[PDB]
Design a protein around this nucleic acid. Structure first.
Ligand SMILES: [Mg+2]
Lengths: 450, 448
RNA sequence: UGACGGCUCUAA
DNA sequence: TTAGAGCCGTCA
């Protein structure tokens, strides 16, 4: 029953080739035992010495790379290995699998150079078969080769360690549902009440001009200020379409089908956003193809709102949270926002060059993750909200759309491993006066270093 | 209030009949499918790059570590993972004789310089592959407007694989910036950088590391996606490229008929029906040639919606038994599904379905076998819809997840978008570099 | 001008 | 609605 191979290595230290060597050793047919390859009750104990090093081993392998002369784990087992070899009165029992090249000839454990050492420093191609040929010439027992066990045992080691777990949990979307809408949509057109030269994008209320068919959402008497001769008309001759049916697609006529109306509502639901940004006291940024809106410097309680740091300083520069909106209504009438980070030297004047803005943007969001991002997005929506339940976006004089602030909830099935604390990094809390107190020193110094 | 859905990660197949989800983990344990014993990969470059290449080769044999060695696992060595010899001596290591440093006069034409440098490398490779007798498998080029596409374009007609590397990547540690910093800091990804180079250069040296092994027979995941050429005189003229993909990943590529398929007003891309029949039939006949049986389905993938008249150009060349459905793939439309609690986003493989045609799929996230997310910030999904035809949305979702893992240019855990898209993206640009050559070859090595 | 991801700007 | 390009960190 003596058909096993023992592996000794620094399990916690930088000895990770023992994993792949053991898998190949069991893959090639040899029955190999290592510290990691037996992980169901602790890692290493006296039980390894108790049975296998005496009764169930054929070779003993030492990873003498960096601290073999120093580590107690490699030394305490080697002491067992040396005397158990004498009890067997064999010749070749321990093998010095030297790994580190930096281990000089004058710096090596005294108790390992007793037997000749196979070489792995320059390349494995010399060492992989060197174990193989030595085992054959020494008649090491060999099960018939099979890689099925190597795959099977590889999964077991890293199955409880990490895999998908079917535990139900919810997710917070980027989609803001819309539940209240004006009951009707009106199109005003006489071909003479308005000309085709003046700008419609600058109109006091959301409305744009097409080549032949005009669109708006207000009455005929709400556009006197831009140009006169509009209030004299009556609303009975306007083109009224039920909004409750304009989106479901049931409506369809000759001038425009239902799908043209869907594109029109999107244009109106988006152009109307810019007017609400003059009511919540935020600055506007000439973003490409959209508009980014961010809160000014120290407007809220010390650059932060609701214990969320929506505004902060990145070293020399000042960063501010901001969003850009987009209204889509295909699966359901919802509002969409694109998260943005906007930089300014002080706040009086933004940085003229866009390249520095993006490059600085890249670094700032680098140390950001899910919750650190999600909580900072919902914050900029709740403040923008004119009410706790929803926001009030003005589209008409007496009718306004209502967009909820709480995003829609999606619940899944597979989230993450059952044990908590996936990454035990930077969890302690110390008495600090400013955020990133010691962190900025680490970040700034590394930039100077590299 | 609605409900999400998750798709199990498809398991690729490796040598010895062993399947492991991670391409890097399974390859080290078992090895590639085809064991190309002779890896005589030649090198063609300047002497400084050559010794940089020579230094890198011995580094490949030695293990290369990532300072965070759980998200980007070990790279023990080329002879260990693949079992195929490769050193700095068996190479032909022919030298690009570019040490001439003299300037009689310059000219205000960067394209002329770009054409000159590209031309100066093509002839050297040509003069070698014909004169010699030994089997050189790769011709790695070293570089001290665009170069890569035309360098591959001219080399495409000669049927000889080539890879271009080493602007600053191979010797990044010494090739720092002008202020004592690594201009491309790979200290974090040192182990992973050698992973992709070893896997990719092995594949284009006649290799084929891994192929999918949980498929239903009789399928064909053809990839058809339009491209654009900025050098075309006709404003609407742009290149269309097809792409045949089977389970093994070694399909065929046929250059589609270039023509004015761009609509500035409608903002869409469609071809004439007549040539649509030929492109599908040419691809359909090739699959029958390499399989002897007509497919039971053709999941032609695309990234732009298509009209109906083009669809009627496919329903007649397809036999009665065959069925074909064209799935559109998009990612611009965002849907960021932040997790309720914790800083770890949703894992890859989760999908959102809105109807029988349109659906969202997350191919990025913290992998339950990596403890890390393949994206910087919270990752947006890919919007995929069944444009025309009738199929099962779950099946294409599962298959499109599977097809994302079969990328050979890189050995990452799983590509964000299917290789049928990204590989088509680069080959189209290569085609636009030199449209003269009618290049139908099955091998992707002269492309990737 | 290794690879992936991320947004960011460029027209049509 | 879609591409092409372009900087840039490397995934708690
Ligand atoms: Mg490549």
């Amino acid at each position: 029953m003596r058909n096993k191979i023992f592996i000794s290595h620094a399990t916690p230290e930088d000895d990770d080739f023992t994993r792949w060597l053991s898998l190949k050793l069991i893959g090639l047919g040899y029955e190999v035992w290592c510290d990691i390859l037996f992980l169901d009750k602790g890692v290493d104990f006296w039980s390894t010495i108790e049975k296998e090093i005496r009764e169930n081993t054929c070779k003993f392998l030492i990873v003498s790379s960096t601290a073999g002369n120093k580590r107690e784990g490699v030394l305490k087992e080697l002491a067992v290995a040396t005397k158990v070899k004498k009890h067997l009165q064999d010749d070749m029992f321990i093998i010095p699998l030297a790994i580190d090249e930096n281990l000089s000839y004058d710096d090596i454990n005294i108790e390992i150079v007793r037997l000749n050492a196979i070489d792995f420093k320059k390349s494995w191609a010399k060492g992989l078969q060197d174990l193989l040929d030595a085992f054959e010439k020494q008649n090491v027992p060999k099960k018939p080769p099979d890689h099925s066990k190597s795959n099977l045992l590889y999964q077991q080691i890293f199955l409880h360690d990490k895999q998908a777990i079917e535990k139900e949990e919810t997710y917070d979307s980027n989609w803001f549902p819309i539940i209240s809408f004006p009951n009707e949509l009106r199109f005003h057109r006489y071909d003479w009440r308005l000309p085709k030269q003046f700008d419609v994008r600058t109109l006091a209320f959301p409305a744009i001009r097409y080549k032949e068919y005009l669109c708006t959402f207000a009455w005929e008497y709400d556009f006197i200020h831009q140009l006169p001769k509009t209030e004299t008309y009556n609303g009975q001759e306007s083109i009224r379409i039920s909004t409750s049916d304009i989106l479901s697609g049931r409506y369809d006529t000759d001038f425009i089908r239902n799908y043209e109306c869907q594109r029109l509502i999107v244009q109106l639901i988006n152009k109307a956003f810019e007017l609400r940004m003059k009511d919540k006291n935020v600055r506007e940024y000439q973003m490409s193809k959209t508009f980014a809106y961010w809160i000014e410097k120290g407007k809220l309680e010390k650059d932060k709102f609701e214990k969320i740091k929506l505004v902060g300083k990145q070293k020399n520069k000042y960063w501010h949270f901001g969003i850009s909106a987009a209204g889509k209504l295909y699966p359901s009438p919802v509002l969409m926002v694109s998260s943005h980070i906007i930089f300014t030297m002080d706040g009086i004047n933004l940085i003229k060059s866009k390249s520095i803005q993006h490059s600085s943007r890249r670094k700032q969001g680098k140390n950001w993750w899910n919750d650190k991002w999600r909580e900072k997005l919902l914050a900029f929506i709740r403040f923008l909200s004119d009410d706790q339940n929803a926001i009030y976006l003005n589209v008409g004089s007496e009718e306004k759309i209502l967009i909820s602030n709480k995003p829609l909830k999606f619940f899944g099935k597979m989230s993450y491993v059952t044990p908590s604390e996936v990454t035990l990094e930077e969890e302690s809390v110390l008495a600090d006066i400013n955020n990133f107190e010691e962190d900025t020193e680490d970040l700034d110094e590394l930039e100077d270093i590299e | 209030m609605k409900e999400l859905i998750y798709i199990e990660e498809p398991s690729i197949l490796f040598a010895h009949g062993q399947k492991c989800t991670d391409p890097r983990d399974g390859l080290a344990l078992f090895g590639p499918l085809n064991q190309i014993y002779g890896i005589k990969s030649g090198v063609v470059g300047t002497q400084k790059g050559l010794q940089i290449f020579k230094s890198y080769l011995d580094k490949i044999q030695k293990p290369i570590y990532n300072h965070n060695n759980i998200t980007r696992p070990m790279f023990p060595g080329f002879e260990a993972v693949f079992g195929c010899k490769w050193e700095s001596q068996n190479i032909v290591f022919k030298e690009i004789t570019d040490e001439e440093i003299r300037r009689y006069l310059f000219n205000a034409s960067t394209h002329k310089r770009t054409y000159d440098l590209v031309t100066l490398f093509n002839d050297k490779i040509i003069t070698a592959n014909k004169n010699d007798e030994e089997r050189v498998d790769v011709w790695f080029v070293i570089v001290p407007a665009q170069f890569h596409d035309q360098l591959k374009a001219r080399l495409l007609e000669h049927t000889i694989p080539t890879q271009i590397l080493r602007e600053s990547t191979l010797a990044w540690r010494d090739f720092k910036n002008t202020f004592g910093a690594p201009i491309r800091d790979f200290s974090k990804i040192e182990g992973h950088l050698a992973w992709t180079i070893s896997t990719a250069a092995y594949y284009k040296a006649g290799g084929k590391p891994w192929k999918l092994g949980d498929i239903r027979p009789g399928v064909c995941y053809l990839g058809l996606v339009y491209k654009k050429i900025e050098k075309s005189k006709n404003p609407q003229n742009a290149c269309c490229a097809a792409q045949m993909f089977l389970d093994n990943g070694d399909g065929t590529v046929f250059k589609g008929e270039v023509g004015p398929w761009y609509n500035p007003e409608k903002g869409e891309y469609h071809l004439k029906p007549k040539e649509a029949k030929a492109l599908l039939t040419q691809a359909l006949e090739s699959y029958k040639e390499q399989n002897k049986s007509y497919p039971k389905e053709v999941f032609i993938h695309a990234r732009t919606r298509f009209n109906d008249e083009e669809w009627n150009a496919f329903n007649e060349v397809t036999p009665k038994n065959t069925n074909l459905v064209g799935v559109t793939i998009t990612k611009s439309k965002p849907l960021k599904l932040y997790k309720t609690e914790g800083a770890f986003p949703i894992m890859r493989g989760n999908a959102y379905i809105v109807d029988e045609k349109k659906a969202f799929l997350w191919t990025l996230g913290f992998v339950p076998k990596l403890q890390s997310t393949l994206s910087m910030e919270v990752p947006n999904p890919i919007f995929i819809e069944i444009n025309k035809g009738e199929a099962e949305i779950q099946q294409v979702l599962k298959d499109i997840l599977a097809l994302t893992k079969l990328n050979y240019n890189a050995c990452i855990y799983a590509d964000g978008e299917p290789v049928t898209l990204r590989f088509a993206n680069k080959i189209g640009e290569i085609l636009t570099a030199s449209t003269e050559i009618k290049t139908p070859p099955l091998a992707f090595k002269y492309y990737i």
